[model samples]
Target: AAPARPAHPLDPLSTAEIKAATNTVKSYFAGKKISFNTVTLREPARKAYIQWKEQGGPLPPRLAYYVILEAGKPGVKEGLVDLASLSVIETRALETVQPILTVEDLCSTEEVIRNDPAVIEQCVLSGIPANEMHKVYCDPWTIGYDERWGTGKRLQQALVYYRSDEDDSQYSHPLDFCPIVDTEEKKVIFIDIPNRRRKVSKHKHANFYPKHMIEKVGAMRPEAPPINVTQPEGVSFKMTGNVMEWSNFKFHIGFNYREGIVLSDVSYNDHGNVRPIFHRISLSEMIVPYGSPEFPHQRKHALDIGEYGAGYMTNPLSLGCDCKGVIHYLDAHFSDRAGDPITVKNAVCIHEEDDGLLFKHSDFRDNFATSLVTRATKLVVSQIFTAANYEYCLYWVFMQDGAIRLDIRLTGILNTYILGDDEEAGPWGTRVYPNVNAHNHQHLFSLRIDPRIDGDGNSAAACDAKSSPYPLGSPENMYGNAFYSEKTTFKTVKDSLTNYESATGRSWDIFNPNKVNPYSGKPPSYKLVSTQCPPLLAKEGSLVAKRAPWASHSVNVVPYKDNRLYPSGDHVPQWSGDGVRGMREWIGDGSENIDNTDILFFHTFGITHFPAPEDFPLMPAEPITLMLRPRHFFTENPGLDIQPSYAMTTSEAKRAV
Candidate 1:
């Protein structure tokens, strides 16, 4: 190869020449600036001018520069300055050409090698090259967003598997909204979403305008009297001393033919399905002056009249009247004393029938109408008492079911001193017996009647069940062992059905002339005692009792919650004594079966007391009557779903004519 030596490999540059060119190139640009602004050239001239400027030379041909300088620069060797030594730099530049050639050559070789049958054949024989294996690639970018989010089919399947295999954790406490479907099987589930807690205002400001208007309108007007009859001739009203007396109190009776027919028809038609019917009646008392020991200062008194009616019946219809000629008659006869000047005022009596629709008539207007007539009679009697120097007030009530019913409430002023714990204390500073600290001494003393419906369209059972308990203590069985005592006898006559008497020697007769002895005879004292024990007495005849007295008033009857019947399975069983007691027992695994009647009778005191004040002017002297309104006293949502009604009607014949 040396003998056939080809032309110089670097184009036209020889070994010596290339050495000189490389040396020149190395010395060029030793302190030159490399920036376009300083090099100002354009297009084809730009690159050539930059190279020339960098080399500090007149323009060198591109091919010559590359062949001589660019190709030889890599051969420059260190610690050599002579021309021949510079040939080493040229030799190095020549060597760089081989790498360029090798890269190009390899690319060509790769194609050839890939296409060769021999290589392919060898790879197949050896089960393909392990390091050069090809994989079925997938483009993740093109896939759906859901798949990229990692919640695609694969993740969902894994989640379900993990949930199914996991063991459920037991709760330390039960969630209130959660319901147990199968306690034994550990299958509890949440039944409903709990209501979120929120803030609400408790203060409610009500407008007083409606209430004022109601009072201004007054009560509904009274209706005409149902019965009218002539009075006896010798029934002149008289007043002796402070006593006003009506000699004869009587009323004529008339059959209510319409009522009788309606009852008969309803009984026959309805038979077993007959609804209950109710009847209401009332009585009145007159306040007047009557003869008494105290002269010019005569006493005021009240006289009981009579009333009759029927109430809430299903069958075996029976009606009757209750008339009291004189309440103190027996007392006067026994003690041979004159009646006291006692006055009853602000009294009203109401009787209502239970025929759902008919009961509505016993509203304020109807009740007032009946009372108006009674008041008139009282006024007639009061004329006599006023002339005797006795001022008075009277109030009375009458009700009936099967038997005659009568109730009397007396209201009068007394000349008693305001006694205090300290005898020297002024009336203003008096230590009132019943503490009037607002919470403790609010007194309510009144009478109440609750009529029951019978199966025979009559009030036989209703009247008997209610009135029989009065004047007589409740049955021993109905009372608890703590409430039983033979010494605690109630007031009643021994033999006479109509006679007024009491075991405590209290007179029940209003006609008794000796009934007015304020300091002697029966003082109308109710002995407070434990229903389970003996009568409780104060220390040395003090007015207050030693023990808390049980309530025995008839006015304490209240409706049950939701009007539900007793002995219901869902009712709490432990309320036998008090509702509070029942709640306590229900805290644990216990049943509820409370008898409200027993608790009300044995534990609570019936009567309440309040001291009289001079500021309270004679209590208006007019009876304040209240009606037992029906359950649906007013529409649940007034005018919400009501329809307009026709105001008038015309006859068909008249319209046609």
Candidate 2:
């Protein structure tokens, strides 16, 4: 704890404090031995945290942790209930609040992925060939999806492995097996090989693509095409500890138990004046719903962040691989299998990039046409996570044009367990391998946004443009060929509950009415425009759907309240009934109005993933972008002055002519 550290609050609890926090809990358990899963800062409530920072105050040196205690025999296994959550709140600093223990409504602290690496190794040694066993790839698993894991306990999730090695190692190995685990008992569970003895993910064609037969195919043919980025003069971004400064953007990097990484105090320099925008922004929860409708296969839904935590598993990116162009890295702390605090270096990367064309235009004069074009170079803050068999890369870019864009890349191996041939599996999935059935699925992700929009007082509204039924129809439909534009002002919290409509070209904006744009004489606002993407196509309120109600709607708006951070209410396998309630219940009754007050917004984005033949060994990274640009916030093009080093100069072109 250095007094001189400027970004002290944004920094994680000291490694020593985390150690003390873990040791502090043992007194409560006393003689009952317990194992800790996560020992990190249990971030304070947002309102309180904000105040502490604003007042140049002292953080309550707090810590939050999750653990699992032995309720059964040391070697015995437990099911749907073993991980019914254990959390503690305490500190090693001068006492403000005494230590507190909380046992929340039943929830699992992710799918117990800490044990995955071990399980993958054990499964390979016994059955795999003595020589071919050396190579290792990804292992697949999901949250306990179906109703099969009743209160009777035991039965967390299953996994499959890829053993072949390629220059592109992930794809070389595939087919022939699956392994289940008892997460609470910390032991391997069952198997589903060609034998189909377990009957899980069973496809009749399980005989074709054998692991021994699948060829080592991966990377790109004749090596990858050359793509390079560089800041010839070195990087413009600088870090004053965790707080970052680059171009006109400045903010602090903060990570809590749930959101993983959060951007706070985000502001953009509007032509010299720094104006606040978002107080915090980060991925809230992600749901990957599988479409396998057989026995246990029907019960496959994964909350990558809610269950296991995407932030906790961020990949250790290298200089030339995950990022380029003057990469600056950030370090994060996590508990290893030994409950020791370890640092994940380069867990996050920040860099600048040339983002295609900013704008181009030409004007025809008396003799010739004069043209000028400008290219955009943006600041990108990025991170990647390799969870189970999937790898997701998230990038947030800040542009000179008052815009924030989110890009997501998904790369992973799909479950190749086979049950039927193309005839039976045709509708649900594709035969990615000779005998493996790569199931169809969808990836839905939610971003929790607190748009400060110049001040804490912010409100959101909708603006839509649609084709009219008749031409010159005025207020009525006549020949069924007219066009019109409309705006909806949200009067109450319930009024703000909405989704995007492709037909109407619907877009939502959060604005601060009090802060008007000087030129437009209107409030400075930001618009959420989604790209061509699909929402959840699963049945509403069904088993998989209910588990993740946040994915049900394209967006949900609610007043910013304390502790309403996650969409899934602290646990999974909780879709309905009285157990766990997530975003669906958080908005049970939108009694308050949100016309011109502080607010929270969730913008949903997803992709309908259908396994294609090319996705055999390793699936290529599927990238999707969600943009929120300045609607009325800026009077003109924010990037109008942007000039890339390689772009043509208007004067140079004119002189040559």
Candidate 3:
């Protein structure tokens, strides 16, 4: 059978492509019970894609990367299928390594716990009747790794909770017991009992729903008039297939089961010439490591992307509420457990936003009338994904002035643990509710950036503001006020493993060493300006540290390699991080040359969240922002050509309002 081809080389797998790939795999394992774990696009190599995109060469072969589990098997079978030929190209049988926790896997965990006699006994002890199993709930999370089980079984630790009714928020009434479920065996394996026991809270539901809020607070706050966003002539961007062109910037948008949103082949149009910037960029991986040292609490660090896929948990956006203004949406496609195609509409939202002022100037003379002002607008590509109890709102913004910004806003309910009325939540957590304990945790994200600034031979350097070398009375600095930026280029992988320095106002730059800025006489580059990076709070050799080695450093640069996406490794569910895969193995002896090469730049940035009273029931959005600004790459102000919101010359100053 002839398979359907993607619209472009970078477009995600079409429905036909998925069905053909799945069928091909299914036939290979005929008469065997197998479950489809993942079936997504296998992106072409960098050289192949460039040749096809730029040189008008033959299109690269369409391929699908798949992971499937056979019944009674201990691990997953990873394979790649040639969609064009409808045949399997490669296959590998992995042992002991578990695939990601699929949505289907998560959906079935609660039912497995509900019917277990042992779990029912634990629930009865926690103040819930055995007959009230329907009122019991669990937020099943990857067990991370337990020394006792040692990755021998695929496991999930059900954080048990109770609700008076189905609609009530269960987090407010968390139970004290934790049950471990063997996902493959489909039963409860073990239960982790706390040394101290606490009963479910008897306080009011602490619900944030409209009905409960209205009854508690009298009524909703006085309704405000509608503030509508309208674009009469429509948006200022064009999408030819999946390639987006907006405000002189061109990039391909790709989505998959792992990385929810991917931006590839990002370039800027300088007049008529096309200048390459980032080859590809995405949030590779992130860890939410709770700061508790209690038993079973050590298993709370979850590699959200690896354990639970971002693409699977992404929410279909609403029109006016989730996104406003003139918006364009791209749907995401995936394969279900039965090897059937499923689609999530509006998985990616693309729109424009008013970015306030771009540039402004006014002269003191002529009564400050000869003024020029230009208001900026930016292109935003965004997606929001829910990881159990948290919502991560990701926004990738492109400015008219050639600046790219990444904003991550965290919201949703906090993952709570049971707290007794007589106990205070020591220093590890806060009592957000009467008996709901919210632990402190950090959301450290690894941002993978494959740079093609001008060309592919790029280098990363640490640029820090430094004071004058001379003393106060020295000849170089008589007044001792001289300051300049000191740039240090990384020569090897070890040299690139650096951390943030707030006191020095440190930033990193990815530059094309071969290409010099005409006016500045410096390498054309984009500077990474971010200060929100918090160090991984986990101790060295700790599971969180071993599982997320990329988070230990604020910045990392390595020679670009194929299939080096996830820093934690390919299969992250139950692995103990003892194999030294991904970033750990990529670093090797730390002697690999990274200077003036095709390099992948990683920036670890996020916030350490501590809950408060006002954060209970729900949390307001907490944002972390970072920017990649064109540094010496531009000759002058890039927004000068932009139309000004208000402009007046001295001759017309008298008539200007």
Candidate 4:
């Protein structure tokens, strides 16, 4: 029913027909003035023949032609031809007018070989030669990889799509893009096409660009303890009380006893010789019932002792004028006398001569006209009896022309007497008493002796006597007298020695039956003994008693020169009376002459008291001997000036020089 259709639009022609058509198309376009509307065959045909001339023989390996119009006639019929089929131009033009011709050299027309230098040059200079053109379909990924991908290294290259010209108008021919990696050392670098100066920037490495994408690499675990952490306990003392106020004193007091025991092996006799001495006494001897086996018997004994020794006791006097009577009297008059039955005192006195008469007394008081003097007199008498039981020697010596200085030494054992409980018995086999309630009390036991100076700027002597007028005076009197005195007033020896009478004509002989003369003929021989039990001082309870016997007791006497005398060439007479002259000599080392100066000596006394239950027993083995270092004894700040640096450093040698 439909009109007949052609089997195929394109069909291969025979070799003869191709050659005939080619020659026909060539001759038709050779010189003919043929045009198809605005087109002409002149220039295009000349260029084609020139190309064929350059190729040296054949126009090319292939050719093609198309006819548009016959001659230059309007509305003429057109026909297409292969260059190989054309033999003559007139016949071809007549058969097909206005033919479009294209020539390709078939000799090199193989599909792979089409990109040869000559072929490529022609295509680059102009459009692809018409004869060589062909319809081709392209695959995007098959094109050359983006030059940007081949940047840093071959292994790191990336693939890119090749955008074809006909694919999308917006897509570029060679893609320009890169991948990103994050890293520290080489954080960023641009990828560029080979031989291209322009590079696409902002193309960061994946590991280096986006910080979160980076993977952390090594282990960094710590091996030591952390900083600012608290340490374990037990490294320091357990703090108590006010932390700020605590110091070496508290630590020493709590630990000294234990430490001392450990250091006992380091002790030596020479060390003990220089150590200060301490003496302890019990209250039971003067107050018997307080420590007696009988009910109230100890109390009765104490009262009796107090009364008997009230006026003539030697304890006060042995302390010298400034300390003697005043302190003892005050103690007896002020404290509850039941438990503390005995009162003690101290004195510092000097010896001098007035109008060729020996005057021995303390210069500390302005006048010897008060109850203090009488009290001093009583203590002096008692001290004489007690002193009869100790040994002494000139332990220290100093010599300057015509003068010999001596320091008295009285030695005794420090004792700790303890009273037994109700279950225990005394050495005498009596019922033991105990004082269950005893408060701690600090007892300061001190001895004050006058420092004597003389004319000629030398020390005359150092003496110990109960005779002194300044007993229990103000500190000013004591210090001032010691520093500026020459002559002083003292108690009569009759008052200091036992059984002696006072200036008031009162006799102290009837006070106690055991009393002995301190200066009767010669000092008595004595010994020291030590013992310990429990604390003997109590609040108010039954009495217990303990005793330490005198192993040996004796006293020593030595002569001392008055350094206040005139030196070898000095004709100046010694100053008199005011006490200043003697003070200067005593302090000046015999450089001046001073009047009213005399020798100084010491009288040491030792006494025993029965201990009560309140007096705890000393620890096993030995009683503790607690002694304090002398205060301000040296003239200068001795050891203070000798610092640790001076002793330890080599630099001190240069300083010394």
Candidate 5:
């Protein structure tokens, strides 16, 4: 029989823990008509974690956090349950804030839209027949924030579309109007009719289904040959419970309702010594702000992780499809609307990949015959979560050369709108199809890194590659073309509010200022080597910026605090964005000292997408990469210990001859 206990304090809540926690809440509201919103692990505080992890003390208390909705309740009921006693230890009543939307909540809206007479009439206005309501569909999106209703009710704005046939992709035939559905009430609250209407396109279905493709195009393109991945022996990494160790890197994997994959207690084994790197790292939050200024289009920005949870919408992947090559998967558990525990199998995938050469040296004197070539291998932990119209494929890569990288691939059908045959989409969007307009949008992600470099006290700094201060041909640059790196340490939160500067090749570093590297006489640090940081395109005081203040800047170092995972606040459904929340609140007054302290480093980095015809029907994977590379953390190359693929000295080569 398998053990029914958590191996580590930071492990995600088990099924039994979820059931116990939800049942405790059920007993607390014995006679009320309640719905379970969220049931997740209440992570132990930093002090508690350190006491048990570092000091080898007794295990920390097991706790669970929950959010529930009561019938006719104004807002939400949030509380914590002690798993040991199966009791509610604390409770908080939140008002004017809604919990994350579940898949059920999003699914039920299509029925609401299909049955509503108003919605059906609007559909008819957009060239859809009244009885053809069954063909109608929508991608239920959080209304961002509506000036009319604000956060008064739990709402979802249905981005209406239609599919002529069962298997057709609905994105190509978008309707002209939008409908607001009350998720709790399960009814259409209001219809947002566009002043100028564009009827659905009469073009053939923009579908990618194999069957449909054959029917439409007579024959599909040449089939791609099979590229099989084989590992005859086994994987290199070892997983003890949820903790993983591979290539001198060790870390714990955590998944929750909000962030899909969280890496914690990240450390590197230096020969025999375990050196701390990051305490925890996760994609805390993300915002997709669409560029359009029409009446209801102003409410186009979506805080995906906040409004709709990543763990909730995560896809249950299949082998040879979502992942390949000796994959090991971890399942995720969560509470359904009925307070019953539900599991998402294959929620996270862990595998290894060949990354070409790690390092190589060849001597031209021997015609490049004598060399040392060590191949690079990467350990990838990945997950794919669908947010309405897009599939975010996230790969967290642990490299052989003391580097951690995040490679995000965006793929899925574009969220499109109906453009009149004669009307131009203009600068706001591109008409991917005859009448299918894909709007310009920016996907900005907040990467939260709680650094514990060497020890708990770490500092963050900005380093920019710059030309020498001395003029060209001066004493310092006698031969000209002298360059240097300008390092700027952040003493206060205000000093850390920085943005990416492409001109200076700006990058960030998190280092232990108290611990110096012996060889370099510098601090042991990890440098953030992300260059695709695009500023929040929304207005400064606009709803998007207010709700997602962390995305407004590229780098922000703040003092670490308990329950500071989400950057767009705890409850983001229909948030007014009037008052500061999340990152804005943590960075209050910008005077808080962040130097040489337990700090959280937040970096906003992502791509801005402008859809084209090739992206329509079904978009190919668009990849963006960033890395955290070790800086002066080791005396020599970290991958030197790794067995090389080939190594030959001059004496060995001569002896072979």
Candidate 6:
């Protein structure tokens, strides 16, 4: 059985810890600040943070709080507060600050229940018959605004409801009912609710309605009985502090405030030697930008991690439901807006499985022709995050062939709003369900891979298979059979901004160009290949296009700079930033001499979700695979080393005469 591990050093402060820390801040505030809007445990100090990656280093227990203070009223020049202190249960000595923000706070949620009465009543006024109350509720309404509408940027709320008797949580539930709230003028913005409701066709299809949580959707649709993933001989993974060890790999795994699982000191044991791969690897930032002409809809671009954060949105994974196979579940920590501990169980899951054939071959040299096939085993370390309607299940699968695949499955509820059945999306989206227009959106995920190839001083070299003009590169071929493959090297980071040409097989490899292989005399390196690599789709001059610069291209390589982990920056606010600076700022300084110093490789994986009329109750999971295969990292096919699992040779397969 696998053993459970304690929370990482950067885990959220316990309720008592948070209270003590905040109370001490209150003392510093001279008892003026009695109430707070939000208080999240901030990132630990650099000295204490790096220790988590150092072998045998101490965790240095401490808690820094990033609290949002609501001064006298909700929108009274909101203050940005930060407090730091040692996390001893009784220690009150601390440092606190209440910084005055030049700009107002982001669109935030603080449990304002003005919609309490209006929600139920407005549903009826919106023509949502009393019979459909069970299927009615509101998505996280935002304070939407526009100058043209004469709407000042005041705190407001909106309500959008779905119509689905066949419950699929919030997915199939369409947004037919639209409600709005006035901040200073407290009352339902009636007359506008039903008027805003689109003249759309309701998707009352059977598949669009999901069966409730009781059981099988249909008699033949029962969930397959328990698929247990147990290890009879104990689990293979070992935990010491926040670090983990599995197979021949040793690494430190911890949750980041926005980056979810962060991997550090990623090293592999080659025979008896330990080699470093990545000093730190994390999914830097993800962008989900929605496009539409609708007032607030056009203003919707979600930075899941930045706004809600991965730590706060992490789901406690269950063995049979979320993961299995001798899983060593890891817990994540976070404090709520009330500054209370919110410990997520099994936030990270680690396990192993046979993905496919590790290697294969055949020998027809003798009368007893033979073949060899071995199971392709991989150790998967992954986590799933649901930031409201959409869910992203991210996986870092370590294949036995020295391949680390970044597999992400985008299967969750769609970001749906109300639209007319007869009304076309006006070229912005598609009509998916009855009255529900499944908006067209894009999800762009960026990975910060800090590959410490060989000994760290590495460079990125582009080795693309270029085609020739005539006979390949020359005008000689009549048939397309004559082609050419070309390769090149980037002089700086800017030159490294490459694109994916599936036809030409373009790729960039990180290698210690100095460390040549003994047999081939070529630099041993690791390469990444992309298939239909997603690119940013935001229209020109859109917020997402400016806020997310690196997303415009496919691959970006840069010289490593400490604390530059997030691609989309610390916080991408819904209503802020002249233009958010993240990967753009990092790479804006121009590419460094990447031929040997630590380098960070970034690859963006994107998905364009077009809602269908059928699977709205819950988007039936449509899985897309990101297969990472090793190229020239090893001297030869390393999978060949897998001991023969089927070796029934000539005599062994024969019976007595």
TM-score winner among the candidates?
Answer: 3
Model 3 global lDDT (CA atoms, 0 to 1):
0.91
Model 6 stretches astray by more than 4 angstroms: 1-67, 70-125, 128-136, 141-159, 162-230, 468-485, 575-580, 589-592, 627-630, 639-641, 648-657
Supply candidate 5's per-residue lDDT for 325.
90
In Å, residue 471's CA in model 4 sits off its true spot by 21
TM-scores vs. true structure, each candidate: 0.20, 0.79, 0.99, 0.16, 0.98, 0.79
What are the per-residue Cα lDDT tens digits for candidate 6 across 65-159? 44444434333222222333432233221112111111112222212222346566655655666556655655553332232322232333444
Greater-TM-score candidate between 1 and 5: 5
Could you give candidate 2's per-residue lDDT for residues 1-657 as a string of tens digits? 212322455566555555555555554456865555456555556666667866666564444444433445332111111011223332222111101111111123123322455444444443443344334333434435434444234444544434333443333234344455554554545544443322212222222233423532332246568886656788767888778887678888876444567787788887788888898899988878788775556546677777667666677889997886688888777654344666778888888887777777655551333566677778888888866568888888888777888888888666555433333567888766554567888888888998888877888887789776455645576656666667787776677667778777988888997888888787898888886456678887676666676776776787777667777765443233234456766667767767677678887788888888777566778889988888888788776665643444456567768
Which tens-of-lDDT digit does each residue in 1-657 have in candidate 1?
011111211112223343343343345423422110000001113234334433564543322122121211331121212232232222222211111011111123222323344433333332344233221010000001011222111100000000111121111011112111111112212122124211111112111234433464654446677653333343343323212222121111111101000001001012233222121112111111122222111111111110000110001211222212211110000000011111111111111221111111112433232211111122111110111111222122111111122212323322121121223323222222221111112111112121212111111000111222223344633442322112211221111111111332222111111122243432111121111111211232211110111111211122212211111011111111222221122222222222111110111211122324431212223222322221211212122221222111233323544
Model 4, position 528: C-alpha lDDT score: 16
Pairs in clash, predicted candidate 3: none
Better of 1 and 4 by TM-score: 1
Q: Which candidate, 1 or 3, would have the higher TM-score against the true structure?
A: 3
lDDT of 1 at 483: 22
Candidate 3 lDDT score at position 245? 97
Which candidate number has the best lDDT?
3
Which ranking of candidates, highest lDDT first? 3, 5, 2, 6, 4, 1
- Model 3: how far is 105 from its true place, Å? 0.9
Which is the better candidate, 3 or 6, if ranked by lDDT? 3
**lDDT of every predicted structure (CA atoms):** 0.19, 0.62, 0.91, 0.21, 0.89, 0.60
Report each candidate's C-alpha RMSD, comma-separated, in the order given: 52.5, 7.4, 1.1, 60.9, 1.6, 6.3
lDDT of each residue in 158-212, candidate 3, tens digit only: 9998889788888899999899999988899999888888877888777988888
Q: What would the per-residue lDDT of candidate 5 be over residues 479-501, giving only the tens digit for each residue?
A: 77888899999999999999999
What RMSD value applies to candidate 4?
60.9
| Model 5 TM-score relative to the real fold | 0.98
Model 1's TM-score against the true structure: 0.20
